[PDB]
Amino acid sequence: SSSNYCNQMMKSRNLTKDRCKPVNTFVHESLADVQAVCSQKNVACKNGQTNCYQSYSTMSITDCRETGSSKYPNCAYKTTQANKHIIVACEGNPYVPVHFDASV
């Protein structure tokens, strides 16, 4: 809870205001294009359920990973930017992303 994108965004989005969340991914794409993944390549989820979908193309993502020296309240994060296929678990009507399963 200092500067760099992950520290700023984890705090602003309320992920680290009351704990330091170990890992979080931000997707730099329009939300409707991320919701569009739920009708793209169906794949098994790590847990063997099959409501997961892999994006046809890679997307711009920022991975935020807590450093080994982070302790609440001063959460600290390593920022890694990547372009990866995202795998999301989908539910409901509208069938929409509710969990990340991976990035590949």
């Binding site: 965004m9 989005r13 309320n14 992920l15 979080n24 991914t25 931000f26 997707v27 730099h28 794409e29 329009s30 939300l31 991320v34 920022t62 539910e91 409901g92 929409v96 992303p97 509710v98 969990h99 990340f100």
Partner: peptide, 15 residues
């Protein structure tokens, strides 16, 4: 209160 779909966007969206 926050739906699961709203929480996914809050946590991962950055349009």
């Amino acid at each position: 209160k926050e739906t699961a779909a709203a929480k996914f966007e809050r946590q991962h969206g950055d349009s």
